[PDB]
Amino acid sequence: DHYNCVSSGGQCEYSACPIFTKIQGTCYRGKAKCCK
Fold it and tell me: Which cysteines bridge via disulfide bonds?
């Protein structure tokens, strides 16, 4: 979720993860990806 994604160094993103990161979990009631 948003809290855990931010706490663990990820970024919540609605669209493709920024370069050199990838999906690992979700944010925003499941509508976004946690990119790490």
Answer: 5-34, 12-27, 17-35
What token pair was written down for 7?
């706490």
CA distance 18 to 8: 16
Q: Per the structure block, which two tokens stand in for 21?
A: 């990161």
Dump the DSSP string for the chain.
Answer: -HHHHHHTT-EEESSSPPTT--EEEEETTTTEEEE-
Q: In Å, what resolution does this model reach?
A: 1.5
Contacts (Cβ under 8 Å, ≥6 apart) of 31: 14
